[PDB]
Amino acid sequence: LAPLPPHVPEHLVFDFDMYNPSNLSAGVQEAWAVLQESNVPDLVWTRCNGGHWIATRGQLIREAYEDYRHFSSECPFIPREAGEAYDFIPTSMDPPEQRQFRALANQVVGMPVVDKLENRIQELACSLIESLRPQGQCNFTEDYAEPFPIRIFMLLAGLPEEDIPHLKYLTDQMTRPDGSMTFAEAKEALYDYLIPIIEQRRQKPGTDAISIVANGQVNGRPITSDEAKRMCGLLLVGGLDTVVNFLSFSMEFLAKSPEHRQELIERPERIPAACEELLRRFSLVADGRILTSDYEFHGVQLKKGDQILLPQMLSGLDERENACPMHVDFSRQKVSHTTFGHGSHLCLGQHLARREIIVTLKEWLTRIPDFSIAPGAQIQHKSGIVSGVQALPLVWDPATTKAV
Ligand code: HEM
Ligand SMILES: CN(C)c1cccc2c(S(=O)(=O)NCCCCCCCCNC(=O)[C@]34C[C@H]5C[C@H](C[C@H](C5)C3)C4)cccc12
């Protein structure tokens, strides 16, 4: 618990630990939602993890993400040391500069690329699902959620599938720290893999995402090797943990809700809507900004340098945005959320993400419509910048499945 800064008033103090929420065992989303109980301010300060603000309501969260002038992405993560060392592009960049890098990044992961990827996504999901189907069980997170996104990224960046385990080892030690490496060290190791590949793609460019980024033009001039590297770092990890963990939260829910599974089994056309409502209910991201100058925000005095956590996850869980937010209703009429962010940094991979989600849900229910959490298994959730599921043991009667 860091010393309380003089400018922060005692009545706004709420010591929430974003890395180890008090009631995590009851569900990570449930753990964060405590920040939304009637007796909690819209904006509080926690002395945990170095000390920082936390917008607790969709309104303030959306507003801060819109006001990039006061809320910079220069240092987007908590703790401060992680945010300061983080230099990915364009996530650690504020507009107007960020504008064109985002446009270049969009060429390789935006809507265009998606349609061309469908067949590979479709094929990968089925292939993975078919290998499990006859087994009658699996650790969904390990056997499907983990290898799905990386494989998609490899095809996207035109990298050898042989490097998957190595790349997975690199990203894993960065996003799932065990305490052996500082964030910076993990980043360098990851970069050490990318540096040479970019050098090669710059001299002899192909049609892969990496060749496009590395030879792109930004703000009236050629992108530097260093910048290309900083963009590829993000294009790599951006679609990993978020997709892996979200898919897990989804499957855990469906495994525990036979009623909801049947709904989608009988009404397959409702899967797209089910995906949006799940994206809201099981939102899992939470990064933030740093004050560029002293600023009064909704009656609260913020000082230059203050870090503010703007939980993407919380907007959609806000009762004020969605009636009885914790209830999953595939028939919800105005599903509002900021699961993919908000403002100038709104997720460029959102369309790819939705396809990965929808294809997974469609292809899985088609082959394994009836499954459950392994009896006696207590699902453990993890909290952080990208909350998730430690493991998802699943079981099912192979006789109720079918190869397609
Ligand atoms: C269910 C999965 C996903 C979620 C919840 C998610 C979440 C987010 C969030 C909340 C942001 C904005 C962060 C900020 O404002 O600082 C963001 C940005 C980004 N995401 Fe995703 N995302 C997902 C998947 C993907 C995938 C599939 C990729 C693509 C390879 C990806 C790449 C990006 C990129 C490039 C940005 C940076 C955009 C900018 O800074 O201009 N995302 N994502
Ligand atoms: C004692 N002190 C002071 C401390 C010191 C050191 C470590 C500590 C840890 S810690 O061990 O948990 N380390 C925290 C840093 C983990 C950063 C994860 C990087 C994610 C990369 N992905 C993104 O780019 C993205 C960017 C964007 C948002 C989001 C999803 C996508 C899109 C990918 C993230 C916790 C608490 C305190 C610690």
From Swiss-Prot:
GO molecular function annotation: camphor 5-monooxygenase activity; heme binding; iron ion binding
Known catalytic reactions: 2 reduced [2Fe-2S]-[putidaredoxin] + (1R,4R)-camphor + O2 + 2 H(+) = (1R,4R,5R)-5-hydroxycamphor + 2 oxidized [2Fe-2S]-[putidaredoxin] + H2O
Organism name: Pseudomonas putida (Arthrobacter siderocapsulatus)
Pathway the protein takes part in: Terpene metabolism; (R)-camphor degradation
Main location: cytoplasm
GO BP term (any one): (+)-camphor catabolic process
PROSITE patterns: CYTOCHROME_P450 (PS00086)
Oxidoreductase in keyword set: yes
Keywords, in A-Z order: Cytoplasm, Heme, Iron, Metal-binding, Monooxygenase, Oxidoreductase
Lineage per the UniProt record: Bacteria, Pseudomonadati, Pseudomonadota, Gammaproteobacteria, Pseudomonadales
EC number: 1.14.15.1
Gene3D superfamilies: Cytochrome P450
Class in the EC hierarchy, top level: oxidoreductase
Gene name of the encoded protein: camC
GO CC terms: cytoplasm
Function per UniProt: Involved in a camphor oxidation system.
Binding-site list for heme: C347
CC cofactor: heme
Family statement: Belongs to the cytochrome P450 family.
PANTHER family with a match to the protein in the record: P450, PUTATIVE (EUROFUNG)-RELATED (PTHR46696:SF6)
Subcellular location, record wording: Cytoplasm
Protein's name in the database: Camphor 5-monooxygenase
